[PDB]
Design an enzyme around this catalytic site. Structure first.
Site, mmCIF file in Angstrom:
data_model
loop_
_atom_site.group_PDB
_atom_site.id
_atom_site.type_symbol
_atom_site.label_atom_id
_atom_site.label_comp_id
_atom_site.label_asym_id
_atom_site.label_seq_id
_atom_site.Cartn_x
_atom_site.Cartn_y
_atom_site.Cartn_z
ATOM 1 N N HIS A 13 22.663 3.338 106.739
ATOM 2 C CA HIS A 13 21.417 3.256 108.357
ATOM 3 C C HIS A 13 22.008 3.897 109.324
ATOM 4 O O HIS A 13 20.844 4.538 110.043
ATOM 5 C CB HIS A 13 22.485 2.094 109.017
ATOM 6 C CG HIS A 13 24.172 2.838 110.030
ATOM 7 N ND1 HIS A 13 25.484 2.438 109.346
ATOM 8 C CD2 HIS A 13 23.836 3.011 111.606
ATOM 9 C CE1 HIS A 13 25.741 3.039 110.634
ATOM 10 N NE2 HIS A 13 25.194 3.178 111.535
ATOM 11 N N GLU A 54 27.330 28.565 112.470
ATOM 12 C CA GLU A 54 27.120 27.585 111.987
ATOM 13 C C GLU A 54 25.973 27.970 110.714
ATOM 14 O O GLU A 54 25.320 28.477 110.035
ATOM 15 C CB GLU A 54 26.185 26.810 112.875
ATOM 16 C CG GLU A 54 26.591 26.298 114.365
ATOM 17 C CD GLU A 54 26.991 27.749 115.318
ATOM 18 O OE1 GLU A 54 26.599 28.525 114.820
ATOM 19 O OE2 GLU A 54 27.082 26.817 116.154
ATOM 20 N N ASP A 63 27.116 1.149 102.880
ATOM 21 C CA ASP A 63 26.739 1.392 103.988
ATOM 22 C C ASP A 63 26.579 2.939 103.311
ATOM 23 O O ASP A 63 27.737 3.699 104.010
ATOM 24 C CB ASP A 63 26.870 1.302 105.301
ATOM 25 C CG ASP A 63 26.298 1.865 106.311
ATOM 26 O OD1 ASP A 63 25.193 2.547 106.214
ATOM 27 O OD2 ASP A 63 26.707 1.891 107.725
ATOM 28 N N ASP A 121 38.885 4.399 119.373
ATOM 29 C CA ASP A 121 37.792 3.613 117.611
ATOM 30 C C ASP A 121 36.575 5.222 118.206
ATOM 31 O O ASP A 121 37.011 5.613 118.646
ATOM 32 C CB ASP A 121 37.592 2.518 118.750
ATOM 33 C CG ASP A 121 36.577 2.145 117.631
ATOM 34 O OD1 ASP A 121 36.292 2.147 116.657
ATOM 35 O OD2 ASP A 121 36.159 0.458 117.767
ATOM 36 N N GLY A 155 26.514 7.256 117.835
ATOM 37 C CA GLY A 155 26.686 8.993 117.631
ATOM 38 C C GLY A 155 27.891 9.313 116.024
ATOM 39 O O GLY A 155 27.599 10.503 115.642
ATOM 40 N N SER A 206 28.542 7.248 113.546
ATOM 41 C CA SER A 206 28.334 6.893 112.438
ATOM 42 C C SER A 206 27.969 7.728 110.963
ATOM 43 O O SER A 206 26.722 8.746 111.461
ATOM 44 C CB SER A 206 27.345 5.783 112.148
ATOM 45 O OG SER A 206 28.014 4.557 113.086
ATOM 46 N N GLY A 207 28.387 7.790 109.998
ATOM 47 C CA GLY A 207 28.142 8.596 108.939
ATOM 48 C C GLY A 207 28.897 9.084 108.566
ATOM 49 O O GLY A 207 29.495 10.067 107.055
#
Ligand SMILES: NC(=[NH2+])N1CCCCC1
Ligand SMILES: [Ca+2]
Length: 223
Positions: free
Chosen positions: A40, A62, A84, A171, A175, A177-178
């Site tokens: 997603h 980085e 997903d 939880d 932001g 996600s993934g």
């Protein structure tokens, strides 16, 4: 991450930020050429950002590398978020070091009650909005499948698991996600979905990575 803590710079060295002009999702480095994230989170024009702590400041560790290809799972269903998971290939290999490191894939699924580390740059508030600049961390246990399915009747498949706290307060959130759920040194979950964030009786739902190891290994070997 709601109810977590500041990880410390580069203490989660497999955590990546996916950037399309701004951070929009997490991911996990699984070898020098490949990142795992949530389907997603798919979009074109992804730049993978490795070695990040403060995503708004260049701190010096980085690596910014464009994706050359993305592969969404063949069975991903965007309505239900079943399957997903996606793979992202880096246009040039990452330079691996103590702050940019891969995370191992599972050799089997993890048990309920196993403690895991969940991380990301997502919202830290359960009511309202506040985004951190630095990476946040949360220790949370895998929950029983019955408590997961009871929280989300009709929505949990064998490709999902819940982790967190039924009492609320801790939880993943928008932001995140993934991003990774790591248990016993293995990438067992991907931040996928939930109801609100950190609400009572609504734990986070995560893609069950152990079901995808063969697909991951075969896909990366052929791409
Ligand atoms: N764990 C949650 N509550 N989530 C997953 C990330 C997106 C918001 C819902
Ligand atoms: Ca930075």
């Amino acid at each position: 991450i709601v109810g977590g803590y500041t990880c410390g710079a580069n203490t989660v060295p497999y955590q990546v930020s996916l950037n399309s002009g701004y951070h929009f999702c997490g991911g996990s480095l699984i070898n020098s050429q490949w990142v795992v994230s949530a389907a997603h989170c798919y979009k074109s024009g992804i730049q993978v950002r490795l070695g990040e702590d403060n995503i708004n400041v260049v701190e010096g560790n980085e690596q910014f590398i464009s994706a050359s290809k993305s592969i969404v799972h063949p069975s991903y269903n965007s309505n239900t978020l079943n399957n997903d998971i996606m793979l992202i290939k880096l246009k040039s290999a990452a330079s691996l070091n103590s702050r940019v490191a891969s995370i191992s894939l599972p050799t089997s699924c993890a048990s309920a009650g196993t403690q895991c580390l969940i991380s990301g740059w997502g919202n830290t508030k359960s009511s309202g909005t506040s985004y951190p600049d630095v990476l946040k961390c949360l220790k949370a246990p895998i929950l029983s499948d019955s408590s997961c399915k009871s929280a989300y009747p009709g929505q949990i498949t064998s490709n999902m698991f819940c982790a967190g706290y039924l009492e609320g307060g801790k939880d993943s959130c928008q932001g995140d996600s993934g991003g990774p759920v790591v248990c016993s040194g293995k990438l067992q979950g991907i931040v996928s979905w939930g109801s609100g964030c950190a609400q009572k009786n609504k734990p986070g739902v995560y893609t069950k990575v152990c079901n995808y190891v063969s697909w991951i290994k075969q896909t990366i070997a052929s791409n």
